[PDB]
Amino acid sequence: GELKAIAQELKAIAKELKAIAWEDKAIAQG
Amino acid sequence: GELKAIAQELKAIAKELKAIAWEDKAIAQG
Amino acid sequence: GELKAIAQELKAIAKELKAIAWEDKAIAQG
Amino acid sequence: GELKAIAQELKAIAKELKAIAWEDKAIAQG
Amino acid sequence: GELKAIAQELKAIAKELKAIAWEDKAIAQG
Amino acid sequence: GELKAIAQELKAIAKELKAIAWEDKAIAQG
Ligand SMILES: [Cl-]
Ligand code: NA
Ligand code: NA
Ligand code: NA
Ligand code: NA
Numbered sequence: 270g271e272l273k274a275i276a277q278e279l280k281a282i283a284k285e286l287k288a289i290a291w292e293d294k295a296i297a298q299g
Numbered sequence: 300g301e302l303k304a305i306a307q308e309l310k311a312i313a314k315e316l317k318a319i320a321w322e323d324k325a326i327a328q329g
Numbered sequence: 330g331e332l333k334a335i336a337q338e339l340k341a342i343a344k345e346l347k348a349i350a351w352e353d354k355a356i357a358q359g
Numbered sequence: 360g361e362l363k364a365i366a367q368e369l370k371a372i373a374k375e376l377k378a379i380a381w382e383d384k385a386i387a388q389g
Numbered sequence: 390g391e392l393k394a395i396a397q398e399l400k401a402i403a404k405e406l407k408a409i410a411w412e413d414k415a416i417a418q419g
Numbered sequence: 420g421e422l423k424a425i426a427q428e429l430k431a432i433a434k435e436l437k438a439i440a441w442e443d444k445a446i447a448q449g
Contacts (some may be wrong), residue, residue, distance in 0.1 A: 271426050272301035272302065272304075272309065272322035273301050273304075273425050275422070275425060275426050275429060276301050276304040276305050276433075277308035278426055278429035278430055279305060279308035279312065279429065280308055281430075282308075282429065282433050283311040283312050283315055285433055285436035285437050285439075286319065287315050288436075288437075288440040289319055289436065289439055289440050290318040290444055292326065292444050292446070293319055294325075295444075295447035296322070296432065296443065297322045297323075297326045297328075297329065302332065302335070303331050303334075305331075306331055306335050309335060309338030309339065310338050310341075312338075313338055313341040313342050313345055316345035317348075319345075320345055320349050320352060322355060323349055323352035323356065325353050326356055327352050327355035327356045331362070331363035332362065333364075335363050335365060336365050337365050339368035342368075342372060343371045343372050343373065343375060346375035347375055348380065349375075349379055350375055350379045351387065353379055353382035353383055354382045356386055357382045357383075357386045360391070362391035362392065362394075362395070363391050363392055363394075365391070366394040368403075369395060369399060369401075372398075372402055373398060373401040373402050375407075376402060376405035378390050380397035380405055380408040380409045383409055383412035383413060383416065384415070386412070386416055387418075392422065392424075393421050396421055396424040399423035399428035399429060399432065403428060403431040403432050403448060406428050406435035406436060406438075407435050407438075410442055411434055413439055413445075413446065414445075415441050416442070416446055417442050417445035417449060
């Protein structure tokens with residue numbers, strides 16, 4: 270169903286934001 | 300249910316964005 | 330209900346994006 | 360209704376991301 | 390309807406994230 | 420239907436965030 274697909278896509282979004290957070294941490298640390 | 304799953308994923312997203320804000324703060328500082 | 334919880338989480342997301350915008354503004358200024 | 364509230368919060372979110380893009384452009388110019 | 394309004398606001402958010410990716414590219418370039 | 424349109428726009432958002440992560444990675448490297 271589409272609500273589950275939406276939940277799954279939000280999970281993917283959370284994962285990409287976690288990647289952004291880590292890269293921004295690396296910029297900050299530098 | 301999937302509506303709760305969606306709300307929980309949005310909660311995770313809010314938490315990652317708080318992390319990003321914290322790292323960007325550190326970028327501004329350095 | 331869960332729709333209200335989703336609207337709430339979106340509000341928290343908007344709040345964090347405002348913090349990000351203010352930090353990116355600080356990076357730009359410096 | 361909460362669906363309208365959700366649409367409104369997504370509108371606020373789009374507005375914040377436009378503000379972020381503006382500052383990131385200024386960072387790029389610097 | 391509000392579901393279409395939500396889909397249209399998500400399309401606006403994607404467009405803004407595109408702009409952010411483009412400016413981050415410009416930052417990485419310089 | 421609009422729930423599929425929403426899921427599709429969330430997919431486009433995840434794709435743009437993957438692009439931001441990659442550009443921020445490039446900034447971190449630089
Ligand atoms: Cl930077
Ligand atoms: Na992280
Ligand atoms: Na200014
Ligand atoms: Na560019
Ligand atoms: Na990396």
